[PDB]
RNA sequence: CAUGUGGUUUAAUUCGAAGCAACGCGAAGAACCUUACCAGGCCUUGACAUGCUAGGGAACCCGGGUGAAAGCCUGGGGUGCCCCGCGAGGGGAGCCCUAGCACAGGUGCUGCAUGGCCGUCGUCAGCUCGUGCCGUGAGGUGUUGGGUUAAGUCCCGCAACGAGCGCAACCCCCGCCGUUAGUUGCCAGCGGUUCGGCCGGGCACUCUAACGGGACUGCCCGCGAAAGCGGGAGGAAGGAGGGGACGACGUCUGGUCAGCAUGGCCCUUACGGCCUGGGCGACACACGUGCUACAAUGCCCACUACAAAGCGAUGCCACCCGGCAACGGGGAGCUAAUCGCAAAAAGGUGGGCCCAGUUCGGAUUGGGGUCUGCAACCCGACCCCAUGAAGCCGGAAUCGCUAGUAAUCGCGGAUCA
């Protein structure tokens, strides 16, 4: 889901990282 | 309000969030490239004239 | 085009069995340009073939597509201002095209969950003589012999 | 000329094709760059297209003519056969003979009898 | 029609920049900004002798302001006074090392900008608009050129509806690169409005 | 030991100034690695043609910013004077460091 | 649902574009900025230019009362230059306050008063000139005709012969290779090696650009009068190799006075100017272009691998500590093929899911937080918890593209706080 505000590609499409997406 | 505005754009009296971009040549409100500091219109005009160094016709 | 006939696209032969017909089937399965995915999905069914019957997936594939190969079809055509459903022989390429195509659809028609098993069971019924894609073939050939009256315009 | 070094094969054969067609028709006309004092023809009817030009240009009109012709529109007529190499040769030979005879050094007529057959 | 500006078309191959010089991504704007006001002031107090190619060179405080002119006899005055005070007013507001390298023009009739600004002025002075273009194109061709083209546009004389007078001779292959065709734009003030001017001079080849 | 940068626009003018330095340094000193071209950083600017609305037929330019590297080893006094006097740059902003 | 528009509403909800070629268009960046509209408060020779006279003052730095800001009112420091003069004084170049006149300024109309630029027919195959010829003449001829072609391309033919604006061709990218230059990469070669091409070392390779070569129906066979077409070899690539730029005479009373130039028109204590707040974001509705889905060729978690292009010194941030997190504190490299955004994603391996309004789908809404910025109610963006709506593939109708294309999956840039 490229639209889920809580998923892998969820932030990837939004150009962000956050919790569910690994970040330094 | 065209003339008084181009003068106000160079004023920057209050905070920095008013020193918006403003073309120099024909003094356009928008489409102002920061690099050239010109508007897209006067940009192409000069380019054809050759007054823009290193600015060659792009082709690929 | 109005000028040239435009030659067919000679596809790359099979990279496992050695046959262009197989690879073409992978292409029909290919969704969103994922060959390697569709390829495996095809070979998955190939193994499902040997699971059910001790028959080689190669000939099991030929038998299926062969029994789903539409011999004739009806085509619309104008004459002074009227459409006639004129039937006639199909081109060998188009027959191969439709056959491979219908099968892919017939698999989609099945209730089976995984795609491989859908392709598997469908290829069985097709090679047999009765299946979702096969009946759609039987259907089209009926239309031909049905409108055999208008077959006077062979063109 | 040593200027052939340039000009690619393109302009070469084309320019050679120029020379070919140029000589294909003009060969025999280029020798004179002025309006001829008169015109001689083999059939005033067929080449009447030229007859008109000379006529409108006040250029005298002389020409061998067959029954299939229009004698009234010809100044100095030359009646006789025309659709035969035999008849044409006898006239053209003797005619040009008068040209060289009034010029200088009367030579032997060109080898035509051999070409006739 | 369209017809992209033939100069920007030859920009790379044929004619080089009317202002040649390098600049870093840091101050390219400021450099070209002052570079502009320069040529602008030149067009103002120098159009007298009829300038054209205002060539410019820069690198580091050095600015070769080469200015091609139909007759430098006016850009120098007498001995050295006009040209000198010109360098004065130049660096007077600038800071770079001004260097006015004036150069004549072998023939203004073969120079597009001059041919245009010339006839364009005639129209301002109220003249035979039609034949003014005819003599202009005939002037360049009979001069030594190998292709000419001139076009005015606007209220010819002062008519309501617009119009555009086309006139040219020789060859003007604008689609070809190896042509070296000088462009010649020009204004034309009239008591009734504006007026467009164009000019094309084919010369070079290969 | 020493390293020279030759940034500039026109590669035709860059080639002349770069080759010039190569002859001057080698023909009057120790070894010198030839002109080393780097990936040319280009400023591709796209934009519309018409003044008003025309989201098509747009025209775009590009700023060719070339790069050429040349390395001279042994600091020769002859090469220093040669490059200090016999030079003919123009639109070529060079930068040299040890 | 994002965004444009119609309509409605509003004090304003600024104006333009109107079948194709208006509708994610002008906008490549509306919180006040921007802004041209509206409300309330002020200025009104002005925020900008030029010139002259008059009372006064150099310039210039800091403070205060009041205010929503602007503006209005008002206090302190100060005194460079030249001339007459030891001095005093005062005049004046110049900068500034005020009074005065010429004047500024207008995004206020007219794109049928215009320039410039652009859309479009359409990269469609065409449109014209000179001379000669026929016709009372408009005009024809050439340019038609046969064949061929992407083509008015060329060939054959002809009352035409020739030339010009066009197609072609010259310039850029990607393809095959070489020459030139080896701090990019390289045990290809050898040795050492904390095994990272790190050291030495090397330019063969990859690459980085720079120059040139190659393809010309050139060669062989068939057809033909020719141009050319067809099949094959050689070659990296054949009959324009793929792609770009190039868009003729004219056409549409086509677009734009709101990019700019600009005739005329109209206003001038306001049709000009500054400020605070509001407004382009208003919603009972409809259309256009889009994004995200309706899921098992699929969705979630962990682990792992292959790009290109572009960008970055008061900017890109390695990496360390902290927080679930956005992000904050500390802090190295980097005017940058050498450091950095940076993990390409899809894919690949193993695992969970078992057909469900679902671990599909992510709109809506409650509570709490971070960054930019004076300032996030209107009106920004992104986090974490909860909320989990419609939709189970869509009526009439309708759009895209013939090969690395469609589909599909990612990254960057301009713009810009
Ligand atoms: Mg308007
Ligand atoms: Mg109109
Ligand atoms: Mg090489
Ligand atoms: Mg809570
Ligand atoms: Zn502007």
PDB file of N, CA, C and O in Angstrom, chain D residues 92-117:
ATOM      1  N   UNK D  92      20.749  16.495 -97.442  1.00  0.00           N
ATOM      2  CA  UNK D  92      21.675  17.013 -96.439  1.00  0.00           C
ATOM      3  C   UNK D  92      23.116  17.030 -96.940  1.00  0.00           C
ATOM      4  O   UNK D  92      23.886  17.931 -96.606  1.00  0.00           O
ATOM      5  N   UNK D  93      23.475  16.031 -97.739  1.00  0.00           N
ATOM      6  CA  UNK D  93      24.816  15.956 -98.303  1.00  0.00           C
ATOM      7  C   UNK D  93      25.062  17.121 -99.256  1.00  0.00           C
ATOM      8  O   UNK D  93      25.995  17.899 -99.067  1.00  0.00           O
ATOM      9  N   UNK D  94      24.212  17.242-100.269  1.00  0.00           N
ATOM     10  CA  UNK D  94      24.347  18.296-101.271  1.00  0.00           C
ATOM     11  C   UNK D  94      24.181  19.693-100.678  1.00  0.00           C
ATOM     12  O   UNK D  94      24.817  20.647-101.129  1.00  0.00           O
ATOM     13  N   UNK D  95      23.323  19.808 -99.669  1.00  0.00           N
ATOM     14  CA  UNK D  95      23.080  21.088 -99.013  1.00  0.00           C
ATOM     15  C   UNK D  95      24.325  21.575 -98.284  1.00  0.00           C
ATOM     16  O   UNK D  95      24.796  22.690 -98.511  1.00  0.00           O
ATOM     17  N   UNK D  96      24.854  20.729 -97.405  1.00  0.00           N
ATOM     18  CA  UNK D  96      26.073  21.049 -96.675  1.00  0.00           C
ATOM     19  C   UNK D  96      27.249  21.197 -97.637  1.00  0.00           C
ATOM     20  O   UNK D  96      28.212  21.908 -97.352  1.00  0.00           O
ATOM     21  N   UNK D  97      27.159  20.527 -98.783  1.00  0.00           N
ATOM     22  CA  UNK D  97      28.173  20.655 -99.824  1.00  0.00           C
ATOM     23  C   UNK D  97      28.259  22.099-100.300  1.00  0.00           C
ATOM     24  O   UNK D  97      29.345  22.609-100.573  1.00  0.00           O
ATOM     25  N   UNK D  98      27.105  22.752-100.398  1.00  0.00           N
ATOM     26  CA  UNK D  98      27.046  24.151-100.801  1.00  0.00           C
ATOM     27  C   UNK D  98      27.655  25.035 -99.715  1.00  0.00           C
ATOM     28  O   UNK D  98      28.167  26.119 -99.996  1.00  0.00           O
ATOM     29  N   UNK D  99      27.597  24.564 -98.472  1.00  0.00           N
ATOM     30  CA  UNK D  99      28.158  25.299 -97.345  1.00  0.00           C
ATOM     31  C   UNK D  99      29.680  25.353 -97.418  1.00  0.00           C
ATOM     32  O   UNK D  99      30.280  26.422 -97.296  1.00  0.00           O
ATOM     33  N   UNK D 100      30.300  24.194 -97.615  1.00  0.00           N
ATOM     34  CA  UNK D 100      31.754  24.107 -97.692  1.00  0.00           C
ATOM     35  C   UNK D 100      32.268  24.613 -99.038  1.00  0.00           C
ATOM     36  O   UNK D 100      33.385  25.122 -99.133  1.00  0.00           O
ATOM     37  N   UNK D 101      31.447  24.472-100.074  1.00  0.00           N
ATOM     38  CA  UNK D 101      31.813  24.934-101.409  1.00  0.00           C
ATOM     39  C   UNK D 101      31.940  26.454-101.446  1.00  0.00           C
ATOM     40  O   UNK D 101      32.802  26.998-102.138  1.00  0.00           O
ATOM     41  N   UNK D 102      31.073  27.133-100.703  1.00  0.00           N
ATOM     42  CA  UNK D 102      31.126  28.586-100.596  1.00  0.00           C
ATOM     43  C   UNK D 102      32.123  29.010 -99.521  1.00  0.00           C
ATOM     44  O   UNK D 102      32.503  30.177 -99.438  1.00  0.00           O
ATOM     45  N   UNK D 103      32.534  28.052 -98.697  1.00  0.00           N
ATOM     46  CA  UNK D 103      33.494  28.311 -97.631  1.00  0.00           C
ATOM     47  C   UNK D 103      34.935  28.164 -98.114  1.00  0.00           C
ATOM     48  O   UNK D 103      35.629  29.156 -98.333  1.00  0.00           O
ATOM     49  N   UNK D 104      35.378  26.920 -98.272  1.00  0.00           N
ATOM     50  CA  UNK D 104      36.723  26.642 -98.743  1.00  0.00           C
ATOM     51  C   UNK D 104      37.102  25.180 -98.614  1.00  0.00           C
ATOM     52  O   UNK D 104      36.794  24.533 -97.614  1.00  0.00           O
ATOM     53  N   UNK D 105      37.779  24.658 -99.633  1.00  0.00           N
ATOM     54  CA  UNK D 105      38.221  23.276 -99.634  1.00  0.00           C
ATOM     55  C   UNK D 105      37.073  22.285 -99.653  1.00  0.00           C
ATOM     56  O   UNK D 105      36.610  21.835 -98.605  1.00  0.00           O
ATOM     57  N   UNK D 106      36.618  21.939-100.854  1.00  0.00           N
ATOM     58  CA  UNK D 106      35.523  20.990-101.021  1.00  0.00           C
ATOM     59  C   UNK D 106      35.976  19.559-100.746  1.00  0.00           C
ATOM     60  O   UNK D 106      36.697  18.961-101.546  1.00  0.00           O
ATOM     61  N   UNK D 107      35.545  19.011 -99.613  1.00  0.00           N
ATOM     62  CA  UNK D 107      35.909  17.651 -99.231  1.00  0.00           C
ATOM     63  C   UNK D 107      34.894  16.627 -99.729  1.00  0.00           C
ATOM     64  O   UNK D 107      33.868  16.984-100.310  1.00  0.00           O
ATOM     65  N   UNK D 108      35.195  15.353 -99.502  1.00  0.00           N
ATOM     66  CA  UNK D 108      34.282  14.271 -99.850  1.00  0.00           C
ATOM     67  C   UNK D 108      33.174  14.148 -98.810  1.00  0.00           C
ATOM     68  O   UNK D 108      33.425  14.297 -97.613  1.00  0.00           O
ATOM     69  N   UNK D 109      31.941  13.876 -99.264  1.00  0.00           N
ATOM     70  CA  UNK D 109      30.795  13.728 -98.359  1.00  0.00           C
ATOM     71  C   UNK D 109      31.054  12.701 -97.260  1.00  0.00           C
ATOM     72  O   UNK D 109      31.766  11.722 -97.480  1.00  0.00           O
ATOM     73  N   UNK D 110      30.475  12.932 -96.087  1.00  0.00           N
ATOM     74  CA  UNK D 110      30.663  12.043 -94.947  1.00  0.00           C
ATOM     75  C   UNK D 110      30.150  10.640 -95.254  1.00  0.00           C
ATOM     76  O   UNK D 110      29.220  10.476 -96.044  1.00  0.00           O
ATOM     77  N   UNK D 111      30.758   9.621 -94.628  1.00  0.00           N
ATOM     78  CA  UNK D 111      30.360   8.223 -94.834  1.00  0.00           C
ATOM     79  C   UNK D 111      28.928   7.979 -94.374  1.00  0.00           C
ATOM     80  O   UNK D 111      28.691   7.677 -93.203  1.00  0.00           O
ATOM     81  N   UNK D 112      27.982   8.112 -95.298  1.00  0.00           N
ATOM     82  CA  UNK D 112      26.570   7.958 -94.978  1.00  0.00           C
ATOM     83  C   UNK D 112      25.984   6.702 -95.613  1.00  0.00           C
ATOM     84  O   UNK D 112      25.117   6.051 -95.032  1.00  0.00           O
ATOM     85  N   UNK D 113      26.465   6.365 -96.806  1.00  0.00           N
ATOM     86  CA  UNK D 113      25.963   5.209 -97.544  1.00  0.00           C
ATOM     87  C   UNK D 113      26.055   3.930 -96.719  1.00  0.00           C
ATOM     88  O   UNK D 113      25.173   3.074 -96.784  1.00  0.00           O
ATOM     89  N   UNK D 114      27.131   3.806 -95.948  1.00  0.00           N
ATOM     90  CA  UNK D 114      27.330   2.640 -95.097  1.00  0.00           C
ATOM     91  C   UNK D 114      26.310   2.606 -93.964  1.00  0.00           C
ATOM     92  O   UNK D 114      25.786   1.547 -93.617  1.00  0.00           O
ATOM     93  N   UNK D 115      26.030   3.772 -93.392  1.00  0.00           N
ATOM     94  CA  UNK D 115      25.072   3.882 -92.297  1.00  0.00           C
ATOM     95  C   UNK D 115      23.644   3.666 -92.786  1.00  0.00           C
ATOM     96  O   UNK D 115      22.772   3.251 -92.020  1.00  0.00           O
ATOM     97  N   UNK D 116      23.413   3.950 -94.064  1.00  0.00           N
ATOM     98  CA  UNK D 116      22.077   3.854 -94.644  1.00  0.00           C
ATOM     99  C   UNK D 116      21.482   2.455 -94.502  1.00  0.00           C
ATOM    100  O   UNK D 116      20.351   2.298 -94.042  1.00  0.00           O
ATOM    101  N   UNK D 117      22.246   1.444 -94.899  1.00  0.00           N
ATOM    102  CA  UNK D 117      21.781   0.064 -94.823  1.00  0.00           C
ATOM    103  C   UNK D 117      21.695  -0.423 -93.378  1.00  0.00           C
ATOM    104  O   UNK D 117      20.819  -1.212 -93.025  1.00  0.00           O
TER     105      UNK D 117
END
